[PDB]
């Protein structure tokens, strides 16, 4: 399921912020506007297992260029809350659930 | 400084995120990144190669205030003598050219006075200051409306 | 008939033109 | 002035101060009388300072007012008006 | 020797030696008691 | 008439008497300090030899000895480099896997938690990554172990000591006489042949024997420690014969003029090495051989002692035409009696040369694994650009100094200089017009694009998709360059550089080394901006030089000197009328121009050149080619360049790049601090210091040396120094953090 | 319109009539339920006038006329 | 506690920050060899961090909602170690410096050329003078009482 990092108006938000996806699918975080954008998975309030580095980006990496995607396969029952380390203070916090 | 403090505190309170200000206010990099750089995305995106929105007028003013202020640095750094000599050579050139020496100035051109130059530089500095900050504040608060 | 259409040029082009001409004449000549 | 190396004399101050015209023609009119007799007759009413100034100012003003108050839609998008529904603000609107 | 002493006490040289000594002293104090934010002895 | 060695014995006896007396050179300074201003003066005129005395011989001796001292300093700096590379570096680990390990040759002791700066650079090493590009130089030279680096460091230390001793000995024991310094024919002959030509021949000889066989072994995949030592390749010649068969005959092709047989290692290929991403070493060796021949020939031009040769006076005085009277007659006497004239000419030439060096060095990378080391490329380009700009501004400074001080038509009269001084008004007026015209059309187009974009009229913009301003001439020239090999230059296989065209992208280790650079409307606009800035700074400097002696405002400006605050508030105000103030303004404009140039280089490289190659050959550029469409407006430069790329530096806190963020903020601070000096005057500060001094007098703690406020000229100098430091340092931190995090 | 729902409508300062505007600019600047490009007031006059008692456009017109008379006086 | 803060020893965000810092430091350690110089340095840094956090908890600092220590300077006797006794120490040292410098200035003020002894420090005299700053608190007090600290006639 594709979600764009940052709004067209330069807003620092995900497009849609809340993703309700089915298992067997992988999210692609494509860059839109306001990049460099980073997607980091919480590590907390996260189901059972799932190690953080598997779905996180290094807390010191950033996607560049207008059209760059980050690929995460997920596939684990529960909900995952993700956020953007640089713009987490501007409300760039999202959430993906797999039911 | 007063208005930076007020605006950052209130923009973080209006988001229910007073913590963020509490963490990032203690050091100056927090002010530079979490306030100026962070709250300045929609404003600078007011218009871009993919179109414009209602904030473009501010994005333009934001740049306008940056220009005025910068040209203020001119009158504040460069002083009179250089400009006086430049104007002297300009007067020579105008008086020595065909078809335009038929037109004659009536008040002898001169460089701005020292006090006048200081005043003009200060006026540019202040106008640019005010315009750029007003653009930033209105665009960032109105961009989120919260 | 659109009142703004008549006035915006009137105050932005005609008025500054006439005012600048008149003030240049006043400031720039011996009395 | 100009006797040998002298470049100054009170008798002729104009020459001394270089008050010449580098390119003045001092030649008769290159136009034949007939053309001038037309131009000076049809362009006569525009050679008064106050009259020309007042006429130019008011005529240009009226021309601008007429051309701006009666502009067609393909001219100025400002007065053609919006053609799309309006969007809502983040919470206002 | 005497002139060497004289030049060795001139403002710049004396200041640099004094500040090098002060920097070394502070560096060693921090090394022995690093991360000190309060005075706990009394 | 003859060229010979002339010296004087024991002119100054080494001692410590003058060390104890601050400012022996100036009598009033020698007397002692009355006020704090004295102190500043003592430094402001430390190296102004021509003002402490008037004898040319003493000035020349001091200049020669100071040259020796500076050469010693440079040698010490190089020895430090080599030692740090030898001991505190991961050079061998990087040598084993270049693309894998990030070069580093500096570690920090763990004292106050600063050990965070010892980042993970790879190769089992923790340190500070270096962008000086020394590792590439050492690899290109054939250095494989740290023993060689240690030996080079020790040798450089010894040569620094030798330079220092030479300076002492030549100033205090054997000081050359004036006729020795004034012998320019032999000096030119030796420098052209003895220094440049012979040095290039020596370096070519090294490359043939050490660089070529060692780099061939390294590129063949042999582990660095298993390679034969560089000296073995000289003892046993079959070692070289294996790599290049033509070494078998040995020199006989060179003496029978069968030079074609040397085509094995002396080639004219061009382009880049697909394995290392640098120039073919067999091309560089041939380069240096040809350069050696050319310079050894050119250094045989001027007559010294055996009749054959050229008299520089004859060449100069033989040139003159109807438009310049007797031009070039008298210039020889001007250039052999004034040091400032020579200094200005040489400074201008060296600045231009450094700029050209930057351009050519990022055009075709000459060192292996340098093209894909993006941080090194960016840092080298920016560094050389700044050095060249500063040297060019110094050229104007010293031309004005000469004009004020050493220019004298009564004894040393020159015709061309007289004519220039006689139509300076026309020169400056036309230059002013050109500056205005360029400023309106270069920057005005940017403002037009910005306004159109803000008004929602992209069809009216000056862009590649609306109104195109295509640089047809540059496109044609680079197209002619692309077609050059095989057509107009048959002996070359690949074009001079891969920026010309022809496709043939070159990549190394999954990273793009180089590929054709396209020129469009944005390139046209930025190039015209460059022209505008260069012309304005030239206007400032040239106006400072030409009007240094007199003008229609102050007809006796020379009598005031090269450096002085003003001539009072008369005539409406005569602030900053001196030539020094013109240099002071030229510094600001040079900063502006160079900042724009480096910004253009960085953004263009990131957008259209640097990037990552993939399996299918799809190049993903660091910035996805947004320069062509975003650089045509000021808002794009503020958003897609500054805002977007500042994220790397501002986030650096908590990591090994935190020092870059600290320097970013500190440079901002120092720059803003400079405005304190640039905007105020010394009268207010003196009045405030009066109250401070009174407060001190109230407690019997007032200094005996009265504390005066800084002089006007010193205020200007401090302001410009702080401005330049802050701006250049913030750009330095920004570039380094951005390219190290993203590169 | 603002007095009907003060919290969910942006107050308008004055209309824009700029012949330099492009079509997308005209589209983007028409807000607040107006028929053309307008400016959203931030001086806070709407809230102030609402609190003191002004409700209709007639009251504003009367105030404007009274103040013109006052300036003339 | 004071100002709504809680002691760092029993605070939770303080412990969370401590754990996160150690986790970040350890993340780098696992990359290198177990007993190499970089590994030893990283281990030393981790031990230093643990000791620092334990000491901060030990001294009884106050931690806010951010989980960082906060300094109370109102004068509460439970926190004199945060600003008041360091403040007294600074005042002592700074008065030492100022008194020594003033003594030097007064001593050299009687020569025909006092400026000579100001750009070239007369170290012999300075070494004798520097030790007066041990007792400057008394010298300055009696200097004020005796009425010659402040230059009269001014
Ligand atoms: C544990 C429980 C017991 C504690 C007991 C503690 C006692 C104090 C600590 C240590 C005592 C032993 C110190 C070493 C013995 C020699 C000290 C001395 O007599 O050395 C001699 C000097 C001389 O003292 C006075 O010094 C003053 C300044 O004189 C000179 O001061 C300079 C001296 O170098 C210069 O000569 C200068 O030109 C000149 O002004 C006075 O004018 C007189 O000369 C003289 O009375 O004492 C000085 O202060 C020298 C500098 C060190 C003084 C340290 C004092 C403590 C702090
Ligand atoms: C100082 C108060 C003020 C201000 C800041 C403005 C500002 C504006 N008016 Mg406006 N106007 C005002 C008072 C004011 N008006 C008054 C009292 C009236 C009569 C009720 C009008 C009637 C009016 C009309 C009919 C129109 C505007 C329009 C406009 C806008 C476009 C420019 C223009 O047409 O010029 C102003 C045009 C006038 C006819 C103004 C004449 C009235 C006053 C008395 C003139 C003052 C001149 C005086 C010598 C200088 C005042 C002192 C100082 C401010 C210099 C602009 C934003 C146009 C618009 O709608 O924008 C799209 C438009 O068509 N105004
Ligand atoms: C090694 C012993 C020695 C001694 C005892 C002297 C003694 C003397 N020299 Mg001499 N000299 C020496 C070595 C020595 N020199 C060497 C090795 C050189 C070659 C560079 C020179 C070249 C030289 C010149 C050209 C001149 C003298 C002069 C003099 C006399 C004037 C005062 C003086 O020295 O300047 C002051 C003493 C200093 C220590 C000044 C500092 C200079 C060094 C090089 C600065 C180091 C640069 C540093 C790295 C910059 C970076 C800054 C950074 C650290 C922040 C004095 C009697 C002058 C003279 O005789 O006047 C007529 C004169 O013009 N010397
Ligand atoms: C007003 C500015 C200011 C103040 C009040 C402080 C205060 C402090 N800093 Mg700091 N610092 C500052 C500016 C400041 N800094 C600036 C501008 C920088 C950038 C260069 C730094 C960089 C810095 C670092 C890197 C560190 C500190 C540290 C410290 C603390 C260490 C105390 C100590 O050394 O043990 C006590 C020292 C003594 C008791 C010495 C006096 C004793 C004398 C010699 C004997 C007297 C006998 C009678 C302390 C609370 C250290 C720390 O750990 O922070 C918690 C530390 O690591 N600072
Ligand atoms: C083969 C002949 C030769 C060579 C190689 C040089 C080389 C050099 N000269 Mg020189 N010169 C020469 C002949 C030569 N000169 C003659 C014949 C004259 C008289 C007309 C001069 C007069 C002269 C002056 C006035 C000056 C120089 C300077 C310089 C240096 C310029 C800066 C530089 O590029 O550093 C390059 C650095 C290196 C190449 C490192 C190695 C340096 C080696 C050891 C130099 C040894 C060459 C020397 C001539 C040997 C003779 C001395 C012998 C008794 C031991 C450079 C090292 C300038 C200077 O002082 O230097 C700062 C300078 O001011 N020269
Ligand atoms: C080989 C190059 C070269 C040489 C040999 C000279 C030589 C000379 N210059 Mg010159 N100059 C040069 C290049 C050169 N210049 C360049 C490139 C510029 C453009 C910037 C200038 C601009 C210039 C001016 C405007 C003037 C001179 C002057 C002079 C003369 C006296 C300089 C002096 O001692 O004052 C004292 C020197 C100092 C006080 C040192 C300044 C220290 C700098 C500002 C600090 C650098 C900061 C550092 C890089 C980074 C921060 C470190 C810090 C934080 C620790 C002297 C003969 C002066 C003169 O009167 O000519 C006769 C003078 O007015 N020069
Ligand atoms: C943003 C700051 C700023 C700006 C805009 C300028 C602009 C300019 N400087 Mg400058 N300068 C500055 C900062 C600035 N400076 C500072 C801080 C210093 C201190 C070191 C200097 C020191 C300095 C010196 C020493 C000199 C200049 C010179 C110049 C002029 C060069 C001529 C030119 O470019 O032609 C055209 C002008 C421009 C491109 C500027 C923008 C013009 C816009 C695009 C046109 C808009 C027109 C618009 C339709 C107007 C309608 C509005 C209406 C309501 C009136 C130019 C006007 C040189 C000069 O005077 O030339 C001979 C000169 O010698 N400057
Ligand atoms: C107009 C621009 C231009 C430029 C910049 C060059 C540049 C070059 N040409 Mg070339 N050439 C050109 C036009 C040009 N050529 C044209 C129009 C033709 C005819 C179609 C040729 C035919 C040509 C041939 C056949 C060869 C070159 C070669 C070369 C290279 C060596 C030059 C040389 O022999 O030293 C200088 C030689 C001299 C005799 C000095 C005289 C200088 C001129 C005549 C004045 C050099 C890079 C040689 C090569 O293969 O490079 C490796 C070579 O074999 N050129
Ligand atoms: C604990 C912190 C507080 C410490 C206060 C110290 C005592 C202050 C009062 C005495 C001050 C004093 O005597 O000097 C008072 C000082 C001058 O000091 C006076 O000098 C006179 C002339 O030499 C006489 O010698 C007096 O004896 C002397 O007291 O002047 C003042 O500070 C003005 C206050 C009113 C007197
Ligand atoms: C540029 C400059 C000049 C030269 C400035 C000149 C010659 C002014 C030329 C400006 C022309 C007249 C156009 C300006 C356009 C203005 C926007 C018009 C304002 C007029 C009224 C609306 C007030 C100085 O004389 C000077 C003197 C002392 C210190 C610094 C400086 C200085 O920086
Ligand atoms: S302000 Fe300063 S520089 Fe200008 S005339 Fe007065 S004293 Fe001279
Ligand atoms: Cu983001």
JSON list of N, CA, C and O in Angstrom, two decimals, chain H residues 91-107:
[
{"chain": "H", "resi": 91, "resn": "UNK", "atom": "N", "xyz": [32.95, 33.00, 43.76]},
{"chain": "H", "resi": 91, "resn": "UNK", "atom": "CA", "xyz": [33.20, 34.34, 44.26]},
{"chain": "H", "resi": 91, "resn": "UNK", "atom": "C", "xyz": [34.59, 34.42, 44.87]},
{"chain": "H", "resi": 91, "resn": "UNK", "atom": "O", "xyz": [35.33, 35.38, 44.63]},
{"chain": "H", "resi": 92, "resn": "UNK", "atom": "N", "xyz": [34.97, 33.40, 45.64]},
{"chain": "H", "resi": 92, "resn": "UNK", "atom": "CA", "xyz": [36.31, 33.37, 46.21]},
{"chain": "H", "resi": 92, "resn": "UNK", "atom": "C", "xyz": [37.38, 33.40, 45.12]},
{"chain": "H", "resi": 92, "resn": "UNK", "atom": "O", "xyz": [38.31, 34.21, 45.19]},
{"chain": "H", "resi": 93, "resn": "UNK", "atom": "N", "xyz": [37.25, 32.55, 44.10]},
{"chain": "H", "resi": 93, "resn": "UNK", "atom": "CA", "xyz": [38.28, 32.49, 43.06]},
{"chain": "H", "resi": 93, "resn": "UNK", "atom": "C", "xyz": [38.33, 33.79, 42.26]},
{"chain": "H", "resi": 93, "resn": "UNK", "atom": "O", "xyz": [39.42, 34.30, 41.94]},
{"chain": "H", "resi": 94, "resn": "UNK", "atom": "N", "xyz": [37.17, 34.34, 41.90]},
{"chain": "H", "resi": 94, "resn": "UNK", "atom": "CA", "xyz": [37.14, 35.55, 41.09]},
{"chain": "H", "resi": 94, "resn": "UNK", "atom": "C", "xyz": [37.68, 36.74, 41.87]},
{"chain": "H", "resi": 94, "resn": "UNK", "atom": "O", "xyz": [38.39, 37.59, 41.31]},
{"chain": "H", "resi": 95, "resn": "UNK", "atom": "N", "xyz": [37.35, 36.84, 43.16]},
{"chain": "H", "resi": 95, "resn": "UNK", "atom": "CA", "xyz": [37.94, 37.88, 43.98]},
{"chain": "H", "resi": 95, "resn": "UNK", "atom": "C", "xyz": [39.43, 37.69, 44.14]},
{"chain": "H", "resi": 95, "resn": "UNK", "atom": "O", "xyz": [40.18, 38.66, 44.18]},
{"chain": "H", "resi": 96, "resn": "UNK", "atom": "N", "xyz": [39.89, 36.44, 44.22]},
{"chain": "H", "resi": 96, "resn": "UNK", "atom": "CA", "xyz": [41.32, 36.16, 44.19]},
{"chain": "H", "resi": 96, "resn": "UNK", "atom": "C", "xyz": [41.96, 36.78, 42.95]},
{"chain": "H", "resi": 96, "resn": "UNK", "atom": "O", "xyz": [42.94, 37.53, 43.04]},
{"chain": "H", "resi": 97, "resn": "UNK", "atom": "N", "xyz": [41.40, 36.47, 41.78]},
{"chain": "H", "resi": 97, "resn": "UNK", "atom": "CA", "xyz": [41.97, 36.95, 40.53]},
{"chain": "H", "resi": 97, "resn": "UNK", "atom": "C", "xyz": [41.98, 38.48, 40.51]},
{"chain": "H", "resi": 97, "resn": "UNK", "atom": "O", "xyz": [43.00, 39.12, 40.22]},
{"chain": "H", "resi": 98, "resn": "UNK", "atom": "N", "xyz": [40.83, 39.08, 40.81]},
{"chain": "H", "resi": 98, "resn": "UNK", "atom": "CA", "xyz": [40.72, 40.53, 40.74]},
{"chain": "H", "resi": 98, "resn": "UNK", "atom": "C", "xyz": [41.62, 41.23, 41.74]},
{"chain": "H", "resi": 98, "resn": "UNK", "atom": "O", "xyz": [42.25, 42.24, 41.41]},
{"chain": "H", "resi": 99, "resn": "UNK", "atom": "N", "xyz": [41.68, 40.72, 42.97]},
{"chain": "H", "resi": 99, "resn": "UNK", "atom": "CA", "xyz": [42.54, 41.32, 43.98]},
{"chain": "H", "resi": 99, "resn": "UNK", "atom": "C", "xyz": [44.00, 41.21, 43.60]},
{"chain": "H", "resi": 99, "resn": "UNK", "atom": "O", "xyz": [44.77, 42.16, 43.79]},
{"chain": "H", "resi": 100, "resn": "UNK", "atom": "N", "xyz": [44.43, 40.06, 43.08]},
{"chain": "H", "resi": 100, "resn": "UNK", "atom": "CA", "xyz": [45.82, 39.90, 42.67]},
{"chain": "H", "resi": 100, "resn": "UNK", "atom": "C", "xyz": [46.16, 40.89, 41.56]},
{"chain": "H", "resi": 100, "resn": "UNK", "atom": "O", "xyz": [47.20, 41.56, 41.59]},
{"chain": "H", "resi": 101, "resn": "UNK", "atom": "N", "xyz": [45.28, 40.99, 40.56]},
{"chain": "H", "resi": 101, "resn": "UNK", "atom": "CA", "xyz": [45.53, 41.92, 39.47]},
{"chain": "H", "resi": 101, "resn": "UNK", "atom": "C", "xyz": [45.56, 43.37, 39.93]},
{"chain": "H", "resi": 101, "resn": "UNK", "atom": "O", "xyz": [46.40, 44.15, 39.49]},
{"chain": "H", "resi": 102, "resn": "UNK", "atom": "N", "xyz": [44.64, 43.74, 40.82]},
{"chain": "H", "resi": 102, "resn": "UNK", "atom": "CA", "xyz": [44.63, 45.10, 41.36]},
{"chain": "H", "resi": 102, "resn": "UNK", "atom": "C", "xyz": [45.88, 45.38, 42.16]},
{"chain": "H", "resi": 102, "resn": "UNK", "atom": "O", "xyz": [46.44, 46.48, 42.09]},
{"chain": "H", "resi": 103, "resn": "UNK", "atom": "N", "xyz": [46.33, 44.41, 42.96]},
{"chain": "H", "resi": 103, "resn": "UNK", "atom": "CA", "xyz": [47.56, 44.58, 43.72]},
{"chain": "H", "resi": 103, "resn": "UNK", "atom": "C", "xyz": [48.74, 44.80, 42.79]},
{"chain": "H", "resi": 103, "resn": "UNK", "atom": "O", "xyz": [49.60, 45.65, 43.05]},
{"chain": "H", "resi": 104, "resn": "UNK", "atom": "N", "xyz": [48.81, 44.03, 41.70]},
{"chain": "H", "resi": 104, "resn": "UNK", "atom": "CA", "xyz": [49.88, 44.23, 40.74]},
{"chain": "H", "resi": 104, "resn": "UNK", "atom": "C", "xyz": [49.83, 45.63, 40.13]},
{"chain": "H", "resi": 104, "resn": "UNK", "atom": "O", "xyz": [50.85, 46.32, 40.03]},
{"chain": "H", "resi": 105, "resn": "UNK", "atom": "N", "xyz": [48.63, 46.06, 39.73]},
{"chain": "H", "resi": 105, "resn": "UNK", "atom": "CA", "xyz": [48.49, 47.38, 39.12]},
{"chain": "H", "resi": 105, "resn": "UNK", "atom": "C", "xyz": [48.91, 48.48, 40.09]},
{"chain": "H", "resi": 105, "resn": "UNK", "atom": "O", "xyz": [49.59, 49.43, 39.70]},
{"chain": "H", "resi": 106, "resn": "UNK", "atom": "N", "xyz": [48.51, 48.36, 41.36]},
{"chain": "H", "resi": 106, "resn": "UNK", "atom": "CA", "xyz": [48.87, 49.37, 42.35]},
{"chain": "H", "resi": 106, "resn": "UNK", "atom": "C", "xyz": [50.37, 49.34, 42.61]},
{"chain": "H", "resi": 106, "resn": "UNK", "atom": "O", "xyz": [51.00, 50.39, 42.81]},
{"chain": "H", "resi": 107, "resn": "UNK", "atom": "N", "xyz": [50.96, 48.15, 42.64]},
{"chain": "H", "resi": 107, "resn": "UNK", "atom": "CA", "xyz": [52.39, 48.04, 42.90]},
{"chain": "H", "resi": 107, "resn": "UNK", "atom": "C", "xyz": [53.21, 48.68, 41.79]},
{"chain": "H", "resi": 107, "resn": "UNK", "atom": "O", "xyz": [54.20, 49.37, 42.07]}
]
